[PDB]
Symmetry: C3
Subunit: 317 residues, 3 copies
Amino acid sequence: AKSRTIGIIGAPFSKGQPRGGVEEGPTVLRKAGLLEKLKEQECDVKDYGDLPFADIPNDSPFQIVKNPRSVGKASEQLAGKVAEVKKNGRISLVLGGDHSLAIGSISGHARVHPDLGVIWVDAHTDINTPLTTTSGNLHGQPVSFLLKELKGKIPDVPGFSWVTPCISAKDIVYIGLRDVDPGEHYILKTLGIKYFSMTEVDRLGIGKVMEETLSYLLGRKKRPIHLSFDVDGLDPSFTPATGTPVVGGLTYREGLYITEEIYKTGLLSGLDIMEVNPSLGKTPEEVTRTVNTAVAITLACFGLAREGNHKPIDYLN
Amino acid sequence: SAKSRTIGIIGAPFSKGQPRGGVEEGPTVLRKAGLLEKLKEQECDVKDYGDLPFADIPNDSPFQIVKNPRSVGKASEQLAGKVAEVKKNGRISLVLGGDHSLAIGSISGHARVHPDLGVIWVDAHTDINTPLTTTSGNLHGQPVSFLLKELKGKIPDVPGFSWVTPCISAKDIVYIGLRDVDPGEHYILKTLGIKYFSMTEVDRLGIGKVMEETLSYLLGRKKRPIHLSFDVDGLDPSFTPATGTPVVGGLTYREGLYITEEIYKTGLLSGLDIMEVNPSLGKTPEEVTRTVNTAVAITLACFGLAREGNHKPIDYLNP
Amino acid sequence: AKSRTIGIIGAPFSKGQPRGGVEEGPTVLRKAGLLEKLKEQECDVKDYGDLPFADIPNDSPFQIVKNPRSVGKASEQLAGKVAEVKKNGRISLVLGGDHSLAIGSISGHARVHPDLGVIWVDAHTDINTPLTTTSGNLHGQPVSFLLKELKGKIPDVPGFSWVTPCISAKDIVYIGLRDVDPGEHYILKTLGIKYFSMTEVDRLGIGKVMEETLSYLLGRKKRPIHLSFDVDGLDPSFTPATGTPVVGGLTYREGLYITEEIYKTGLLSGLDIMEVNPSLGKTPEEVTRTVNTAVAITLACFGLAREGNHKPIDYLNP
Ligand SMILES: [NH3+][C@@]1(C(=O)O)C[C@H]2C[NH2+]C[C@H]2[C@@H]1CCC[B-](O)(O)O
Ligand SMILES: [NH3+][C@@]1(C(=O)O)C[C@H]2C[NH2+]C[C@H]2[C@@H]1CCC[B-](O)(O)O
Ligand SMILES: [NH3+][C@@]1(C(=O)O)C[C@H]2C[NH2+]C[C@H]2[C@@H]1CCC[B-](O)(O)O
Ligand SMILES: [Mn+2]
Ligand SMILES: [Mn+2]
Ligand SMILES: [Mn+2]
Ligand SMILES: [Mn+2]
Ligand SMILES: [Mn+2]
Ligand SMILES: [Mn+2]
């Protein structure tokens, strides 16, 4: 099935943020048996490999924005790789790597399917612009580079002149928010972007969240969905090995509910599994707990259901 | 005392339905934790019937892959007789396990007295593998297949199960908490049209709506006896770690108590099973006491213990 | 904003219960950066300091009820202190301290706003009377002294002659209940007090629980809201450093939801943060986890929102 036809892309990149180890995300995800598990789940899996992110000397900061040229380039390569996966009729599965990579993954998916909708699962909005940022870390800015409404608000940042804003404010839905900067909250509110912060999740229940999310995105007619999954969207009791963890997060169950629901639309077209950093587990057990959760989430995106699965044969004869 | 709180305790120290030793020590640790005395503090009329003496079968050869077939079959045979006895005395049978294979007997025996019973099966697993579909060969993952009338023809003649006569239809069983269902089992679940609430349905609806829909489904037409078969692995292993087949993403302590509190409120609980408590499977003694304390909290809630409080029919302000 | 105009009262008092260390709740709550964190979120914060509760050495039990004069005098002083804070047009924030202090906090607050409505977040009903109690600890009795319907059922306890019942049974709502004594259950049910035990929270979800809570207390008419928060209302995995923990509690998320919803009424008028005991965790991280959770609850009462917060300026054009 097209909903189980995948193109894996390794994106070992850390320079959208300062904590070392996130570049190991694709490694520890492959080591956990992701591809073998997808194949056992009746998936058509093609491995596009791990992108070779060539190091850039003298990557001077843009104002306080760190490694602009390195971040801009990694996303540039990825956009090209994602568009290749999409032309081949595969669902793109981006193994991160920090969340700056969402610039390249969403941009490449949008060159093939410009009518896509984005579901952004995360404790953070990642919507600071190179001007509103106080950290200078680009993994906190990808949504700003992608939005149509922000065109003219993004300065000419070295490494990013290839970026054509490809998503409108109406086409993104945030799930999981609980650590949004003042400037970010200003942007989310003035752009009227649809969002379910942890407050809305507590208020409505994940069941209603998913119902409204999907009705908002797919009400009119069918269209491709891009799921951008920052693993910090889940509570640090499930995914501790991540660079910016925030307590009171989505549960392991809520993470499976969201992805089980997206799988059932049969419209998942692009997926990012981001911010896994195996150098940040307090114990090797915290690393394994996180990696296991990221794999579970990925498997649900491609059909693994808690109620069970079976081949269309007769199991009693 | 109220029928809702009139109980017949049956201990079932049985482990040959699965490969991990220690589950036969389940009714020992539960009794040691003060279960029978806690129920008496709750205004319960509690009669202990003792622990069933399970005999050894030395030459218990396998039926294909199916392990210890005679041991498991006779175990449940001795339990259906003891359960039918408790039900004739007008008490709620309370089966302390022991592995889930014992459900064959507990439900078989309860069905001999109240054939109109409904079953609520709280487990991470369906336990609906037939001796033919199973890939593990363990009978603790097979009880429901032996109980369903619709699987009459698909169950071979395993040594030790001759007495078994399927007593429930697919319309008379509700699963809550499913999250580790084999392909053979999922086919059986979907072909037979069994009502179920996996972790997906629990997340979607909330435990409030799960219990409203479960109870309406089973009771809504006519009032009937309830058989609750509770596999402690239905709850997440952060609450019941000391179990043979733990599965992450389970029901919480709160959902567990919510489930059992609602069943008590019906006033129709007629049979109960507290299964798969294995005290030799804790990583630490703390993990064992936690599994044991939770199993006790779940049990007490089945017989009236309410989180909002409990009081005797007296004036507490002017006694 | 008046919903962000605060008056801090430290009430370092532990004699409402037997476990030493709860009197450090104000110390440890301040040290976690509370006042600063509040000023950071645009609040106008005044600190009235910690009350000096002078020793009351001759304090014989009233039957089994321990330290009656000490608990009585502490709430009496706090009631005058809260009434002063309310007269200065500031929301009272009482940093506890054991929960017996809510006699004084609710009493003083009622002196200025007698139409107030109570929200009591707790694993316990704290409604035993000096006669129904079996522990004889006054932190488990505050509600009984404050209810008008129990006037006739409260004996003359030394240190409490100043108490006048200020709230009717209809004007209090419980959330989080899971460890209620039989006598307390008999009182709760006989008075028809509105409650949401952990069973109701599981049945409806916190969203519906907060909808019904604010409809029940604000339906007839908008009035001041007094939130009395016992940190043991939240599950011990979030607030372990407390004297009477009970498993199966409110989650960290549910605690924020309650208080975020309370903030958005713009009617929070009084707030108790009670039962933090930094001498009672298993580890120092368990102490810091409790304190941080109490701080988080506190900030959510004064407008910290998980969706985000921003000043009325153009962040794209500074
Ligand atoms: N909004 C931040 C940013 O760096 O722009 C502030 C930082 C402090 N809290 C976490 C950090 C945010 C970045 C989030 C990036 B992430 O994890 O969602 O990919
Ligand atoms: N369906 C199983 C089986 O053994 O039949 C597969 C095994 C691997 N995961 C758990 C095992 C299942 C049986 C569990 C039975 B129990 O624990 O629910 O009583
Ligand atoms: N209801 C109690 C009481 O002391 O009256 C019984 C005691 C045993 N369990 C906990 C104790 C109760 C008081 C708790 C007061 B608290 O924590 O909410 O301040
Ligand atoms: Mn994030
Ligand atoms: Mn992110
Ligand atoms: Mn079972
Ligand atoms: Mn099971
Ligand atoms: Mn209290
Ligand atoms: Mn309490």
